[PDB]
Write a protein that binds this ligand. Structure first.
Ligand SMILES: O=c1ccn([C@@H]2O[C@H](COP(=O)(O)OP(=O)(O)O)[C@@H](O)[C@H]2O)c(=O)[nH]1
Ligand SMILES: O=c1ccn([C@@H]2O[C@H](COP(=O)(O)OP(=O)(O)O)[C@@H](O)[C@H]2O)c(=O)[nH]1
Ligand SMILES: [Mn+2]
Ligand SMILES: [Mn+2]
Lengths: 255, 224
């Protein structure tokens, strides 16, 4: 494919490890779409060279630069450095449809059927299920929509510096219109690091297509032992082991 | 015609049913208030329940004449669940909104009776399943015997009732978005209905949502 792509984001070498694992798992399950990562100059030169081997396009985004299209918005909203960088995913008009994926996500099965949905399709947030989690969503790249989100980010800002409030406000019809824009939760399982005794966790892998390590603790923060294959994730350790198995096999030798 | 149906199996949850009954009446509900009671609640508590509610309907799954007693022998962990499922047997009403006894109504929710079966709010943690604390349903003996056979053939996760209802109404997450109640109708974590999920219930105490419960309790319930 050339008009559709998976888009991820990393602003440093830490989240770059998650993007490399996410990109690797997308290649493991054989996606016909392209793999794009939005990187910033804070990513080291050697880490960027590793991203070029796993991803088809490494697109540099520096909102701190005066010439960047979101810099004027950043001067008025300095707390949105990462958020405004992510919003650049709507400016990739060389694709007609994209799925954004957080760098702390992991693909367990082919999800190319996500391109059957329309903008904007996303999974419910596990805490407040009336809102959608912005870690995985189907969108349509548009210069116009990009400018409206920059405008909405200026007036609204963000309590935690994230983009969940801005996207939910702009796409305010998600909660009550078209059930087809409700992605199944298995396309964005963001409860693996929050809850331990969820009923769906009685199944190995929880029948998930995509798992999302939402929270303040990320997989690259754990200490791994490849000899034993071990490290609320203590009760369902398959997702931590899967992340580290792919990292040590696919990503670590490239470092 | 239409009624709000709650459930209590002991004198503890009846205190929450009385608080739920006051909140519905305080916010001017034009419907009947029904409560499913078991022989395990004291006669003093049933008499108090008979003043607040318009119908106190007795359910006893230990009675052999009850249709769910045989299923209880196979699944002794579904005592409360099988009693809760008796809400579908109240065929005298055409449409009912079942509410947990640990819920509290902060605004009129009579517009809930605009939905069909089965309409519920998504469940925190796993939002592709609905929370079984608040849901609109149509009473029917056909659906009752259907849920009875499903509970007998499968059971439920940790003896709850959400697993059975989500397995039966398996098309809730992907079919009709009008059957997805807004999360404010079952906030279990402004709001219209708050739900005190967890092991510790409001009556187990001695932040603003809990102070509203104890205000409604000591004012409209405790003098009885
Ligand atoms: O310092 C940061 C924080 C976030 N991100 C990117 O923005 C996303 C924000 O999601 P995160 O997992 O950090 O937040 P959570 O999902 O826990 O809310 C990450 O996945 C990355 O793609 C980044 O590159 N650098
Ligand atoms: O010992 C019990 C347990 C439950 N219930 C009823 O069954 C519902 C089950 O919900 P509960 O709040 O007990 O559990 P949770 O909703 O916290 O999962 C309660 O609201 C009551 O109406 C009851 O009467 N007695
Ligand atoms: Mn994330
Ligand atoms: Mn409850």
């Amino acid at each position: 494919m050339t008009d559709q792509a998976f888009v991820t984001l990393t602003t440093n070498d830490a989240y770059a490890k998650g993007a490399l694992v996410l990109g690797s798992s997308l290649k493991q399950h054989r996606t016909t779409r392209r793999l794009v990562v939005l990187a910033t100059p804070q990513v080291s030169d050697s880490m960027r060279k590793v991203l070029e081997t796993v991803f088809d396009e490494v697109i540099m985004v520096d909102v701190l630069d005066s010439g960047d299209s979101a810099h004027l918005t950043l001067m008025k909203r300095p707390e949105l450095g990462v958020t405004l960088t992510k919003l650049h995913c709507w400016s990739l008009t060389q694709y007609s449809k994209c799925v954004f994926m957080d760098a702390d996500t992991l693909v367990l099965a082919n999800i190319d059927d996500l391109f059957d949905r329309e903008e904007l399709s996303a999974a419910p947030d596990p805490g407040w299920p009336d809102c959608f989690n912005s870690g995985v969503f189907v969108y349509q790249p548009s210069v116009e929509t990009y400018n409206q989100l920059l405008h909405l980010a200026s007036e609204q800002g963000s309590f935690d510096g994230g983009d969940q409030g801005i996207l939910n406000t702009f796409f305010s019809s998600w909660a009550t219109t078209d059930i087809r824009k409700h992605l199944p939760f298995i396309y964005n399982l963001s409860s693996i690091s929050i809850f331990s005794y969820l009923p769906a966790f009685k199944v190995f892998g929880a029948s998930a297509k995509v798992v999302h390590f939402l929270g303040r603790v990320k997989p690259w923060n754990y200490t791994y032992d490849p000899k034993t294959k071990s490290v609320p994730n203590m009760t369902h350790p398959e997702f931590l082991i899967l992340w580290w198995n792919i990292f040590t096999t696919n990503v670590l030798p490239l470092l």
